[PDB]
Amino acid sequence: DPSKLELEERLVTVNRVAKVVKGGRRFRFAALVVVGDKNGHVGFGTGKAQEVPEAIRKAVEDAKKNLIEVPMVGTTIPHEIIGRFGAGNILLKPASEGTGVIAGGPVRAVLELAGVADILSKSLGSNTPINMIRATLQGLSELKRAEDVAKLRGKSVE
């Protein structure tokens, strides 16, 4: 849900894209955007428009519809993951306090808006920003919370 959280947005990129028509070419602006509370909710959008500022506003709305919840133990994630989304392939390893967000490009946008402060990362695959962020979010969706596992397994968190 997005109307109770107060989200910062970040523009990842804006490509000019181009459809062939009878008398030439229709150019639009495809804005890719991450948004997050900086307290464990992040998500991204695209917008396409004829002018850049609108393409961004469309993308921001889109990101607010498609948020996810990031599990966070301290200032890091619970455990190592490799988030794949077609050729996108992001390793995410948990890190000690004071490490900082050692991560690259789009992946950084996601993690910094998510509100992870200490993480290692590496783009092991494609760097096409859409599928890098997809992959990153696949990763963050597949992080397991240690309380939730303990209830699954019928054990203590200890």
Partner: protein
């Protein structure tokens, strides 16, 4: 021909678990029985039952799904393989998903989990990871 029976058991689980089957039936062995006993004691499976036969036996495993049809087993990997074994020292005994998952180590002390083995200060053949 069958080369890794342990891998096969892990794969059988993985596959059954993927199509949320209720139960599956694995041709038995002593080590497969021990693996399955671990999975139960760690709460990756509901039950295991041993059916005896003229051939090798059968292990019936009963998969464990939480409410919301959530899988308890996310994954299982074979580590030591026939075509390249892997052994761990006691200090190098692997943590799996930073403690949420498990590693099954065949040791002289016995077939243990990572927690188990690390307490007894043992290493051994790292059979599989389960998370």
């Amino acid at each position: 021909v069958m080369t890794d029976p342990i891998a096969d058991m892990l794969t059988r689980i993985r596959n059954a678990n993927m199509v949320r089957h209720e139960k599956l039936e694995i041709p038995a062995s002593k080590l497969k029985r021990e693996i399955a006993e671990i999975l139960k004691r760690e709460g990756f499976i509901r039950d295991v039952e041993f059916v005896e036969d003229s051939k090798q036996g059968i292990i019936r495993v009963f998969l464990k799904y939480g409410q919301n049809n959530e899988r308890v087993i996310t994954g299982l990997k074979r580590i030591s393989k026939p075509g390249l074994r892997v052994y761990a020292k006691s200090n190098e005994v692997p943590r799996v998903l930073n403690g949420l998952g498990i590693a099954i180590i065949s040791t002289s002390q016995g077939v243990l989990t990572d927690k188990e083995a690390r307490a007894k200060q043992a290493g051994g053949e790292v059979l599989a990871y389960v998370w």
